[PDB]
């Protein structure tokens, strides 16, 4: 079914303003004026921020502002504070068959700027793993801000989309700003590609860690 398109992450600095987008379809956001926005703190209850395009509920201050035009809604957080750091979800009525629909949410983080570029470090499969009949390539992406990261695996210059995962931010301060990415293969699949790369994309730039070929091309 339809899921509303929201950018995964957004950021700003204290006392500044920031605006978040929620782009739907003609069958949801474009079809109705019933667009809501929720705020979600980790492990807690969702809180209503905006209803009916631009209207607030009681006990939310007048620096949160809503608006929409055509197939796209916007939330604008003016006068940024430290505590405004949360997940922001948009939702729409979407007719009887689908009923409700939600977005993919946006993580707003308050500090901003490309403060620290990631340090990437790669680890190849152990002797114990190869004997077991498995191969795990592990990539560690250390100490970086903004929190948003897009990480990709390339074997001999080809992108690998199979047998991978990367772990999400948690409560701990040092594991909020670090990411681990694990690629799992079999030994006679791992042997076929000489060179393994772990490349990351972040607001500041791109940073790529690899192991160079052991034969001449």
């Amino acid at each position: 079914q339809s899921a509303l398109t929201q950018p995964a992450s957004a950021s700003g600095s204290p006392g500044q303003s920031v605006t978040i987008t929620c782009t739907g379809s003609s069958s949801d956001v474009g079809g109705y004026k019933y667009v809501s926005w929720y705020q979600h703190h980790p492990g807690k209850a969702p809180k209503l921020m905006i209803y009916e395009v631009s209207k607030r509920p009681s006990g939310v201050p007048d620096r949160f502002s809503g608006s929409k035009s055509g197939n796209m809604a916007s939330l604008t957080v003016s006068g940024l504070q430290a505590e405004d750091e949360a997940d922001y979800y948009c939702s729409s009525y979407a007719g009887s068959y689908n009923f409700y629909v939600f977005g993919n949410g946006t993580k707003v983080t308050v500090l901003g700027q490309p403060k620290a570029n990631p340090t990437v470090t790669l680890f190849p499969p152990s002797s114990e793993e190869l004997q077991a009949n498995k191969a795990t390539l592990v990539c560690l992406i250390s100490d970086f801000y903004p929190g948003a990261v897009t990480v990709a695996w390339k074997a001999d210059g080809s992108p690998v989309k199979a047998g991978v995962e990367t772990t999400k931010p948690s409560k701990q301060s040092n594991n909020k700003y670090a990411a681990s990415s694990y690629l799992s293969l079999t030994p006679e699949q791992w042997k076929s590609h000489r060179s393994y790369s772990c490349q990351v994309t972040h607001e500041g730039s791109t940073v790529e860690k690899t192991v160079a070929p052991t034969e001449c091309s």
Partner: protein, 228 residues
């Protein structure tokens, strides 16, 4: 104020039936709509089903996916709603939240916006018990390739139920260590890992160990041996 409290969560076998309760307070329950939502780990929110005000009609509405195996029910006499789940799949693992309509039940804008969300209750559906943790080393593949500092690691895989306890040099290291939050890899493999950073001079000449414990099984001790 209005308060919604959800209960019934826990670890349950696949194919079984389970009842989640939501106990409301702060309003005259029988005249109000109640809606169920689900938050899946590391993904968005989804609507599960809705049961309406009995003044307006009261007939329950469900989502396509869960139709004919979930059932929403009420006891208006004790201000308490239920979600009954039948034939649970491992893909039904999520936090389930209870929610109240925002508007008063007579109102024109009723059944369009939901508020007063509870804490939600976690439902985990079993990936099946198996043998104790397997520990794997993550360390350099060739002699002295390091700069000013060297990083070692322990990778722990093939465990369930969760969690595991990780210790370095018998509790000596409370600094220079990073332990990552547990992740789930393909084929039902729960997976955790921890790194330790030390000076490059020490490597090979100083004994470093990772200690892993899992209480429903046995503890493991893994040594970082010479790269050469």
């Amino acid at each position: 104020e209005v308060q919604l409290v959800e209960s019934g969560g826990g670890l349950v076998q696949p194919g079984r039936s389970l009842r989640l309760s939501c106990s409301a307070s702060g309003f005259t329950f029988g005249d109000y709509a109640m809606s169920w939502f689900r938050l899946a780990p590391g993904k968005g929110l989804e609507w599960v089903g809705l049961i309406k005000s009995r003044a307006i009609d009261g007939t329950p509405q469900y989502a396509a996916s869960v139709k004919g195996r979930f059932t929403i029910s009420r006891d208006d006499s004790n201000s308490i709603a239920y979600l009954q789940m039948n034939s649970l799949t491992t893909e039904d693992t999520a936090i389930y939240y209870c929610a109240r309509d925002f508007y008063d039940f007579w109102n024109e804008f009723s059944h369009r916006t939901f508020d007063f969300w509870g804490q939600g209750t976690l439902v985990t559906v079993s990936s099946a018990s198996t043998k104790g943790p397997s520990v794997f080393p993550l360390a350099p593949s060739s002699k002295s390739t390091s700069g000013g500092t060297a990083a070692l690691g322990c990778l722990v895989k093939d465990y369930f139920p969760e969690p595991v306890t990780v210790s370095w040099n018998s509790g000596a290291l409370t600094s220079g260590v990073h332990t990552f939050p547990a992740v789930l890899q393909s084929s039902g493999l729960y997976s955790l890992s921890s790194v330790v950073t030390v000076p490059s001079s020490s490597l090979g000449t100083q004994t470093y160990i990772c200690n892993v414990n899992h209480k429903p099984s046995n503890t493991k001790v893994d040594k970082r041996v010479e790269p050469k």
